[PDB]
Amino acid sequence: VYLDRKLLTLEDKELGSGNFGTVKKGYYQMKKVVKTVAVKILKPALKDELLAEANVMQQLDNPYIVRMIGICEAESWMLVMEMAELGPLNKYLQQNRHVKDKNIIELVHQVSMGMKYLEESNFVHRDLAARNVLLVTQHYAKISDFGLSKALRADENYYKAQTHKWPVKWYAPECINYYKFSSKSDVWSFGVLMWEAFSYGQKPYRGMKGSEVTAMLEKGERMGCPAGCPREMYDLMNLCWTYDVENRPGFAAVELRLRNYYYDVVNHH
Numbered sequence: 001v002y003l004d005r006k007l008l009t010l011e012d013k014e015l016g017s018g019n020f021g022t023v024k025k026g027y028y029q030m031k032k033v034v035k036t037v038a039v040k041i042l043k044p045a046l047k048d049e050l051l052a053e054a055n056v057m058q059q060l061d062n063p064y065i066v067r068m069i070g071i072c073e074a075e076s077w078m079l080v081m082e083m084a085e086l087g088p089l090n091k092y093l094q095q096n097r098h099v100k101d102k103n104i105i106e107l108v109h110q111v112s113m114g115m116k117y118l119e120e121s122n123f124v125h126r127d128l129a130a131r132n133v134l135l136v137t138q139h140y141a142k143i144s145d146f147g148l149s150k151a152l153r154a155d156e157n158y159y160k161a162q163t164h165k166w167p168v169k170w171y172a173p174e175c176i177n178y179y180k181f182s183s184k185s186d187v188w189s190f191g192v193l194m195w196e197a198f199s200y201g202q203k204p205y206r207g208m209k210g211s212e213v214t215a216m217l218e219k220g221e222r223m224g225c226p227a228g229c230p231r232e233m234y235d236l237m238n239l240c241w242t243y244d245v246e247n248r249p250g251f252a253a254v255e256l257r258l259r260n261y262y263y264d265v266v267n268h269h
């Protein structure tokens with residue numbers, strides 16, 4: 001869990017940043033090999049958030065979730081993860097506009113497999129967006145960014161937030177109206193992630209305020225079908241955006257629909 005600072009080498013340049021601080025590339029020296037790593041470096045509330053994020057990630061073991069190597073307390077608090085070299089999914093698709101439809105289905109199906117595992121494990125992600133999916137290769141995606149994640153109580157199917165910055169354009173109506181977060185609210189966010197991927201990393205609800213997004217959803221309106229997106233995939237996005245939590249599908253149903261459609265496209269090609 002606790003790593004040795006003497007075995008960690010950090011690069012000067014930063015990969016990216018957030019409200020927590022920066023993300024940098026590094027190397028962790030093992031006995032016979034060296035591990036390339038991605039490190040979150042903090043800029044009392046942020047320290048507690050990083051320790052809680054590390055506590056969630058250490059409990060997870062799935063091919064489609066980023067692996068945490070450990071934590072280190074040096075000049076600042078650090079969260080060390082296994083490196084996914086190609087970076088965030090939204091940026092990759094903005095820079096590689098020729099990625100084929102079959103390849104987009106493959107990647108979003110991998111995200112649904114990671115989420116099916118998280119649902120089975122009774123954890124809620126609470127920040128599922130394309131910026132938080134990292135690419136190992138052009139054909140292998142992993143979920144990261146567990147800073148808002150929660151382990152559900154044994155007697156409850158949801159997490160209740162006490163006081164509302166939130167990524168509002170990815171949040172379900174019950175999150176906004178009742179501050180209730182469940183695996184089904186993560187399904188709503190997964191629908192927005194699908195729209196971002198098929199739109200090659202474009203931002204959802206372009207040019208709209210948070211209050212204007214609420215009014216749109218209340219009228220029963222939803223974002224349109226991205227250019228070149230198959231009807232079957234747009235139908236699935238719309239099912240993820242079921243207003244009533246009770247009638248919205250869970251990740252077992254979403255993953256099965258994606259798996260069957262992916263195989264249909266593979267065997268047709």
Ligand SMILES: Cn1ccc2c(-c3nc4c(-n5cc(N[C@@H]6CCOC[C@@H]6N)cn5)ccnc4[nH]3)cccc21
Binds near residue numbers: 083132
């Ligand atoms: C531009 N850029 C931004 C990141 C990145 C990387 C890269 N980040 C990695 C990473 N994590 C990055 C975050 N949080 C950041 C916050 C800023 O927005 C993007 C992410 N959501 C959490 N885990 C885990 C494992 N491997 C990673 N590899 C590689 C190459 C380029 C990169």
